Design an enzyme around this catalytic site. Structure first.
Site, PDB file in Angstrom:
ATOM      1  N   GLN A 150     -28.515   5.022  -0.500  1.00  0.00           N
ATOM      2  CA  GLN A 150     -28.493   5.753   0.763  1.00  0.00           C
ATOM      3  C   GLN A 150     -28.808   7.225   0.464  1.00  0.00           C
ATOM      4  O   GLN A 150     -28.188   7.863  -0.434  1.00  0.00           O
ATOM      5  CB  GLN A 150     -27.123   5.612   1.427  1.00  0.00           C
ATOM      6  N   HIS A 198     -29.176  10.359   2.772  1.00  0.00           N
ATOM      7  CA  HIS A 198     -28.723  10.499   4.109  1.00  0.00           C
ATOM      8  C   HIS A 198     -27.792  11.657   4.284  1.00  0.00           C
ATOM      9  O   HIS A 198     -27.698  12.545   3.416  1.00  0.00           O
ATOM     10  CB  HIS A 198     -28.105   9.167   4.627  1.00  0.00           C
ATOM     11  N   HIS A 237     -15.703  -1.152  -0.693  1.00  0.00           N
ATOM     12  CA  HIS A 237     -16.447  -2.380  -0.645  1.00  0.00           C
ATOM     13  C   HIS A 237     -15.826  -3.448  -1.489  1.00  0.00           C
ATOM     14  O   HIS A 237     -16.518  -4.233  -2.084  1.00  0.00           O
ATOM     15  CB  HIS A 237     -17.901  -2.144  -1.078  1.00  0.00           C
ATOM     16  N   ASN A 242     -23.971  -2.847   1.396  1.00  0.00           N
ATOM     17  CA  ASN A 242     -22.725  -2.660   2.180  1.00  0.00           C
ATOM     18  C   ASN A 242     -22.414  -4.111   2.717  1.00  0.00           C
ATOM     19  O   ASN A 242     -23.328  -4.760   3.268  1.00  0.00           O
ATOM     20  CB  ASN A 242     -22.847  -1.688   3.383  1.00  0.00           C
TER      21      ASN A 242
HETATM   22  C1  LIG Z   1     -13.485   3.688   5.901  1.00  0.00           C
HETATM   23  C2  LIG Z   1     -14.947   3.433   5.678  1.00  0.00           C
HETATM   24  C3  LIG Z   1     -15.344   2.069   5.702  1.00  0.00           C
HETATM   25  C4  LIG Z   1     -16.690   1.731   5.644  1.00  0.00           C
HETATM   26  C5  LIG Z   1     -17.636   2.755   5.653  1.00  0.00           C
HETATM   27  C6  LIG Z   1     -17.260   4.124   5.490  1.00  0.00           C
HETATM   28  C7  LIG Z   1     -15.918   4.486   5.609  1.00  0.00           C
HETATM   29  C8  LIG Z   1     -15.638   5.939   5.471  1.00  0.00           C
HETATM   30  N1  LIG Z   1     -18.942   2.445   5.840  1.00  0.00           N
HETATM   31  C9  LIG Z   1     -19.400   1.223   5.905  1.00  0.00           C
HETATM   32  C10 LIG Z   1     -18.553   0.177   5.584  1.00  0.00           C
HETATM   33  N2  LIG Z   1     -19.006  -1.120   5.611  1.00  0.00           N
HETATM   34  C11 LIG Z   1     -20.294  -1.359   5.779  1.00  0.00           C
HETATM   35  O1  LIG Z   1     -20.729  -2.509   5.626  1.00  0.00           O
HETATM   36  N3  LIG Z   1     -21.068  -0.361   6.158  1.00  0.00           N
HETATM   37  C12 LIG Z   1     -20.821   0.974   6.212  1.00  0.00           C
HETATM   38  O2  LIG Z   1     -21.649   1.890   6.323  1.00  0.00           O
HETATM   39  N4  LIG Z   1     -17.197   0.420   5.491  1.00  0.00           N
HETATM   40  C13 LIG Z   1     -16.397  -0.801   5.396  1.00  0.00           C
HETATM   41  C14 LIG Z   1     -16.122  -1.549   6.678  1.00  0.00           C
HETATM   42  O3  LIG Z   1     -15.581  -0.643   7.650  1.00  0.00           O
HETATM   43  C15 LIG Z   1     -15.275  -2.814   6.361  1.00  0.00           C
HETATM   44  O4  LIG Z   1     -15.880  -3.642   5.350  1.00  0.00           O
HETATM   45  C16 LIG Z   1     -14.994  -3.670   7.627  1.00  0.00           C
HETATM   46  O5  LIG Z   1     -14.244  -2.895   8.555  1.00  0.00           O
HETATM   47  C17 LIG Z   1     -14.090  -4.897   7.302  1.00  0.00           C
HETATM   48  O6  LIG Z   1     -13.724  -5.524   8.522  1.00  0.00           O
HETATM   49  P1  LIG Z   1     -12.439  -6.454   8.633  1.00  0.00           P
HETATM   50  O7  LIG Z   1     -12.469  -7.556   7.591  1.00  0.00           O
HETATM   51  O8  LIG Z   1     -12.392  -6.878  10.094  1.00  0.00           O
HETATM   52  O9  LIG Z   1     -11.200  -5.544   8.163  1.00  0.00           O
HETATM   53  P2  LIG Z   1     -10.698  -4.104   8.680  1.00  0.00           P
HETATM   54  O10 LIG Z   1     -10.029  -3.469   7.549  1.00  0.00           O
HETATM   55  O11 LIG Z   1     -11.787  -3.245   9.331  1.00  0.00           O
HETATM   56  O12 LIG Z   1      -9.609  -4.538   9.767  1.00  0.00           O
HETATM   57  C18 LIG Z   1      -8.540  -5.361   9.359  1.00  0.00           C
HETATM   58  C19 LIG Z   1      -7.285  -5.049  10.117  1.00  0.00           C
HETATM   59  O13 LIG Z   1      -6.125  -5.834   9.887  1.00  0.00           O
HETATM   60  C20 LIG Z   1      -4.943  -4.976  10.022  1.00  0.00           C
HETATM   61  N5  LIG Z   1      -3.765  -5.497   9.392  1.00  0.00           N
HETATM   62  C21 LIG Z   1      -3.568  -5.380   8.090  1.00  0.00           C
HETATM   63  N6  LIG Z   1      -2.443  -6.026   7.786  1.00  0.00           N
HETATM   64  C22 LIG Z   1      -2.031  -6.691   8.881  1.00  0.00           C
HETATM   65  C23 LIG Z   1      -0.932  -7.443   9.094  1.00  0.00           C
HETATM   66  N7  LIG Z   1      -0.099  -7.740   8.100  1.00  0.00           N
HETATM   67  N8  LIG Z   1      -0.743  -7.909  10.381  1.00  0.00           N
HETATM   68  C24 LIG Z   1      -1.606  -7.596  11.361  1.00  0.00           C
HETATM   69  N9  LIG Z   1      -2.675  -6.794  11.148  1.00  0.00           N
HETATM   70  C25 LIG Z   1      -2.877  -6.348   9.943  1.00  0.00           C
HETATM   71  C26 LIG Z   1      -5.395  -3.506  10.224  1.00  0.00           C
HETATM   72  O14 LIG Z   1      -4.494  -2.610  10.780  1.00  0.00           O
HETATM   73  C27 LIG Z   1      -6.813  -3.665  10.632  1.00  0.00           C
HETATM   74  O15 LIG Z   1      -7.198  -3.322  11.938  1.00  0.00           O
HETATM   75  O1  LIG Z   2     -17.942   6.900   0.825  1.00  0.00           O
HETATM   76  C1  LIG Z   2     -18.813   6.837   1.979  1.00  0.00           C
HETATM   77  C2  LIG Z   2     -19.533   5.487   1.883  1.00  0.00           C
HETATM   78  O2  LIG Z   2     -18.501   4.512   2.147  1.00  0.00           O
HETATM   79  C3  LIG Z   2     -18.972   3.161   2.188  1.00  0.00           C
HETATM   80  O3  LIG Z   2     -17.819   2.466   2.689  1.00  0.00           O
HETATM   81  C4  LIG Z   2     -20.194   2.933   3.111  1.00  0.00           C
HETATM   82  O4  LIG Z   2     -20.696   1.563   3.171  1.00  0.00           O
HETATM   83  C5  LIG Z   2     -21.318   3.906   2.839  1.00  0.00           C
HETATM   84  F1  LIG Z   2     -22.321   3.747   3.809  1.00  0.00           F
HETATM   85  C6  LIG Z   2     -20.716   5.325   2.875  1.00  0.00           C
HETATM   86  O5  LIG Z   2     -21.732   6.346   2.719  1.00  0.00           O
END
Ligand SMILES: *Cc1cc2c(cc1C)Nc1c([nH]c(=O)[nH]c1=O)N2C[C@H](O)[C@H](O)[C@H](O)COP(=O)(O)OP(=O)(O)OC[C@H]1O[C@@H](n2cnc3c(N)ncnc32)[C@H](O)[C@@H]1O
Ligand SMILES: OC[C@H]1O[C@@H](O)[C@H](O)[C@@H](F)[C@@H]1O
Ligand SMILES: *Cc1cc2c(cc1C)Nc1c([nH]c(=O)[nH]c1=O)N2C[C@H](O)[C@H](O)[C@H](O)COP(=O)(O)OP(=O)(O)OC[C@H]1O[C@@H](n2cnc3c(N)ncnc32)[C@H](O)[C@@H]1O
Ligand SMILES: OC[C@H]1O[C@@H](O)[C@H](O)[C@@H](F)[C@@H]1O
Lengths: 573, 573, 90, 90
Positions: free
Chosen positions: B403, B405, B503, B548
């Site tokens: 990336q 960007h 990741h 990603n």
């Molecule tokens: C923080 C971050 C993350 C990503 C990027 C950049 C930044 C700064 N960029 C990014 C990412 N992924 C990509 O493919 N492209 C990008 O450019 N990031 C990662 C991405 O954001 C994650 O891979 C994705 O959300 C995963 O989705 P998910 O599997 O649905 O999981 P989440 O963490 O988003 O949500 C899970 C969820 O469950 C909760 N939780 C946890 N424990 C429990 C319990 N025990 N009970 C009930 N609920 C629970 C959370 O609070 C949460 O909402």
């Molecule tokens: O640390 C930021 C990076 O975090 C990662 O979670 C993302 O997938 C990238 F796109 C992003 O630039």
């Protein structure tokens, strides 16, 4: 067509909302920011379980919504660029900086927050009363009637904010500190809990108050309120109030819908501006009150010559201390201890009711249980013990406000090497004499992110009493803090950047007479000359104050609202 | 009693919501976090006007909701305390740190986010497809049918996320960079826009996609959906799935309502876990899958011995560059300039349509207008020019994702001395071989903030291909970046802390055969042995990937959902 | 060439820094805005502490320094002494 | 001559320094001059530089030099945190 329009949805705006929606008026409220506090509109962002379980992270939410007011042009030398990279010949105007701003006469810490609920979605909730010495007069020549009016107003403000002084009464740390300071100053100064706009829900959860607590900001009519009328419009930048040719009345409010990009006009009977100390002044100057551009005393303003002058901001001093070995040992002074931690002979006991005990039973039980359950921990304080919330209020012999506490706004890389249970914050706030030469003004050429006239400060802490006080204040914090512990390395005693404390006042100041008191609004917060224009917020406060100003500002809004209900009739339903 | 329950409201959870609410199922979804994205539940927090006008501040919102997974015990020496202050004799367990964690075998950057919408309320929205070399097989022994299945799934994922590759096509900076890299690598590597889950609303506003875009998370039935059934319960910690004695079926989900403090049981036909790569594993280990406590190969697990093993996290390298003088001059190469800035003889012109022009008319008009309107600015790029969004996708001859960007997650004190228009970010992500010895495990003694078993990593980047690749990756960024500009001081080339990139994969990994492929779920994401339990998210991904992972993870959920609609009947309405 | 410095070679950086006196230091324009209100505070970035107002900070050799001791810079130098090939040589 | 807070966390036996020096085209416009008003510590005319690395071959070389150090150094080990690749002050 509305009965009343309110610019801004912070707690001063919501004060007008509450009073006027409640009295049957058809109200509209605009905010340039958006709803983002979950399903309780404009509520405190710190009221999540996750943030009360990870409170150190909340500094990041605060920093995320403090946008600096005026950033001078940057003149840092970067001379280790690659020879191939584009390199400046001059320190030209970069990255939204303000070339009008002198870096040496700024409030560089001043910032604004643009979200529904305003700054009350992140604030620390401290809500002390001003004593006479810090407060503007509401009644002339009658000290005792002035007191009763302030008492009537403040008591109402405290119910709207849900201000209390006992939410931390069961904290070991809080009481550790409070009692030692009362003892040390015995007689000469009084200590109490910081009055806090807050309600405890459980021993590990506090429902912090906000704009939402004042007025829930739900559109009306609804099931809970079927004969009230209220509409909130977020993502609407208000830019100008239109004056009649007589300058006796406002005829519209001009707005910019930020989602469609369209511009509209709004008519109402009453216009209220509660966009904050900086943005009220910006909107007025864009509307032909005061003077636009660099101050030019050769061109007297036509309306409100005091607007943007006599501004005040407090001096702030800060440190953190690590609790003394003496104080920590005193926590466990009623405990008999046998054995040595971690054997099964280990026993920590006390006698419940023992007249010779220094602490109440509840305190001793917490300490006993912690020490027996956690025999690897070397401190007698329980892990979930709430934080201290101590103050000695401003007095003539110590004319500064004091907070001896734990604030979510940390100023440094939050540290991990010293146990959090030992750490106490110290913040002392000073009062600033209002001077005509201290100003907030707006550029007639540079514009901000919303294409409005760029804010520019011309400010120095006044010589004389302000400066002497600020340095005696610093010495007081040094002296007082040593009673509890020594300074924490990396949090040593210092003055904070000017305006970081966000208690700016006097930008649209209140008085009895426009000329005589150098002011913009009267004691009903009405703008001189104009029948239907009112200003709310900290900008109204004309005096030199050290205490946190918001409760005061609310009190003044309550009084303003009595004027409106006695002088304007709500439209029929 | 529900047809389906889903644990977590991130975008993988919402994928199941969308598919199953849509197919007529009675669905309940729980999240341990709370609604806080404004009136669009679970939407991207970056979609406010104020943050797209102050984008540097958004780093603070990200940092505010990344809570570290496992923080080793701190051993920093503070020896400048006052002699009166309480001072430690040992580095005892302080401030929520994890004594199980070896600091030298950690993913110290790994963090979780607990809010409705999960991490998709803050993410960068990059959504590339994996090529064969990074992807698990969905069809054995038939490369072309494997491709068509992945193509069918990804195409559907891309519509749910609103993935596009032209939202930045009108950016001068983006195209400046893209064209130079295509030229420089002519033939040998292909560059394109980073595919982004996003829709442009105007030239200064992008509606970034999120969990909300997949499924709006509004309770059903409602006016827009009168025959769908969906309820979201925020502030509910899910703690355990209950197994039948046969270990063939789940019988309930045990929950903790965080507001009342009460504990309940929930029955459904189908149980889906989408709590994230870390929290899915934590919940399973709390439910008697895998093994609780420090790994003990002398006690074979009864169920799912691979659970928490073979984990992967990518290596990440970062720098920023300042744009070359050459590239900047090329922006204005079709301009004839007469006079000298700021005189009224000054003239910047071009011929519209001129066959000899290097740029299209639209580009030349922006540059002309900027240069004439802003004659004090020394750069030809317009102030509101969108940021670059460039990538060369992973290939066998360069097996890393790239990336090039501007990311809202800055890692350093954001700087002001160099014009933002010159700055380009470089992030190269490497792939990590799955190894059995790399593990995420849970303490049988230490518990986290929600009284669940404390997560603990035992991880090193594997020797061999992983490490060689990571260092060839670093060299590639160095080589490639020099083509555009030199490094920005304070953003020099470096490896980021392990797990900062977020990741993490393979914590509950997918395969065809539980024993043979060392896995936990099959290709329908069903847990081996159990008829009605499914796992979604990045934890499923068994392979070494650099791109990603979220779009991939969504694709796998779509397929899982086909299995459910073909094997379970929705309750009648 | 002392025993003590060849046994503690990391300290020798301090002897080098101790005898490198900068050639031309531009006038300083750093903002210090957390002074006590009682302290003397500048109105301008006036010529302070031996800085050179002729010097443009953006067209400097800010690292250039001189050494004034008998033996000059050869009392601290790294002792690398390569020949120039034709391409580098007058 | 270390340029940073000399570090202790990584064994000194593992550490290798990399310094690559580039050549600079002589240009008439790059000058060392002396003030006719400002004087130095020895009451001599104050030295003042007017210098930029020349555009063209000097600058291209300096950036190819940086890339060479990056490429060559990876053969021996990865960068030490806090000593990452950089141009030193002029
Ligand atoms: C923080 C971050 C993350 C990503 C990027 C950049 C930044 C700064 N960029 C990014 C990412 N992924 C990509 O493919 N492209 C990008 O450019 N990031 C990662 C991405 O954001 C994650 O891979 C994705 O959300 C995963 O989705 P998910 O599997 O649905 O999981 P989440 O963490 O988003 O949500 C899970 C969820 O469950 C909760 N939780 C946890 N424990 C429990 C319990 N025990 N009970 C009930 N609920 C629970 C959370 O609070 C949460 O909402
Ligand atoms: O640390 C930021 C990076 O975090 C990662 O979670 C993302 O997938 C990238 F796109 C992003 O630039
Ligand atoms: C940020 C902060 C603030 C305070 C504390 C700590 C922190 C970290 N702590 C604190 C404070 N005050 C106290 O008395 N006690 C405490 O312990 N802080 C200050 C307090 O938070 C403020 O004094 C109070 O909000 C002022 O209320 P207000 O007068 O209602 O103003 P707000 O800034 O809160 O809201 C105004 C508002 O108007 C908007 N806006 C601005 N321009 C326009 C235009 N042109 N059109 C429409 N709307 C506009 C904003 O977006 C905002 O919501
Ligand atoms: O800087 C944090 C301080 O900000 C001020 O705005 C508050 O009134 C104090 F209570 C608070 O501790």
């Amino acid at each position: 067509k509305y009965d009343v329009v309110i610019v801004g949805s912070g707690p001063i705006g919501c004060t007008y909302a509450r009073e006027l929606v409640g009295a049957g008026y058809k109200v509209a409220m605009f905010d340039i920011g958006e709803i983002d506090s979950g399903l309780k509109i404009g509520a405190h962002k710190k009221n999540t379980v996750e943030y009360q379980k990870n409170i150190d992270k909340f500094v990041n939410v605060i920093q995320g919504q403090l946008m600096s007011v005026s950033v001078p042009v940057n003149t840092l030398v970067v001379d280790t660029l690659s020879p191939t990279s584009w390199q400046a010949s001059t320190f030209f105007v970069r990255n939204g900086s303000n070339p009008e701003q002198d870096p040496l006469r700024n409030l560089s810490g001043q910032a604004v927050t643009r979200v529904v609920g305003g700054m009350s979605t992140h604030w620390t909730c401290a809500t002390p009363r001003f004593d006479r010495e810090q407060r503007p007069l509401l009644v002339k020549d009658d000290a005792d009637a002035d007191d009763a009016e302030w008492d009537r107003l403040y008591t109402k403000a405290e119910s709207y904010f849900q201000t209390g002084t006992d939410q931390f009464k069961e904290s070991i740390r809080h009481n550790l500190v409070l009692n030692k300071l009362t003892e040390e100053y015995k007689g000469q100064r009084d200590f109490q809990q910081i009055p806090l706009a807050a309600t405890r829900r459980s021993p590990t959860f506090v429902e912090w108050s906000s704009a939402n607590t004042v007025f829930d900001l739900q559109n009306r009519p609804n099931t809970d309120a079927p004969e009230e009328r209220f509409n909130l419009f977020p993502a609407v930048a208000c830019e100008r109030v239109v004056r009649n040719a007589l300058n006796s009345e406002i005829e519209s409010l001009h707005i910019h819908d930020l989602i469609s990009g369209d511009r509209f006009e709004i008519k109402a009977d009453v216009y209220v501006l509660t966009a904050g100390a900086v943005h009220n002044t910006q909107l007025l100057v864009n509307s032909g009150f005061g003077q636009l551009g660099r101050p030019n005393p050769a061109n007297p303003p036509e309306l409100l010559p005091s607007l943007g002058s006599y501004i005040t901001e407090q001096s702030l001093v800060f440190c953190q201390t690590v609790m003394s070995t003496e104080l920590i040992d005193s926590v466990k002074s009623d405990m008999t201890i046998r054995g040595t931690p971690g054997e099964l002979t280990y026993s920590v006991t006390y006698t419940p009711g023992a007249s010779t005990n220094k602490h109440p039973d509840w305190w001793n039980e917490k300490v006993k249980n912690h020490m027996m359950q956690h025999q690897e921990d070397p401190l007698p304080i329980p892990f979930e013990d709430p934080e201290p919330q101590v103050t000695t209020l401003f007095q003539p012999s110590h004319p500064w406000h004091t907070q001896i506490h734990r604030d979510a706004f940390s100023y440094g890389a939050v540290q991990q090497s010293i146990d959090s249970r030992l750490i106490v914050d110290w913040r002392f706030f000073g009062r600033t004499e209002p001077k005509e030469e201290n100003k907030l003004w707006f550029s007639d050429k540079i514009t901000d992110a919303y294409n409005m006239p760029q804010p520019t400060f011309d400010f120095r802490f006044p010589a004389g009493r302000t400066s002497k006080e600020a340095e005696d204040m610093m010495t007081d914090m040094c002296v007082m803090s040593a009673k509890i512990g020594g300074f924490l390395p990396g949090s040593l005693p210092q003055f904070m950047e000017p305006g970081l404390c966000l208690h700016l006042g006097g930008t649209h100041r209140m008085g009895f007479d426009e000329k005589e008191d150098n002011c913009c609004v009267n004691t009903d917060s009405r703008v001189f000359g104009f029948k239907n224009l009112f200003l709310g917020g900290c900008g109204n406060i004309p005096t030199a104050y050290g205490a946190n100003p918001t409760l005061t500002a609310m009190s003044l809004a309550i009084k303003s609202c009595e004027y409106i209900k006695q002088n304007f009739t709500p439209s029929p339903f």
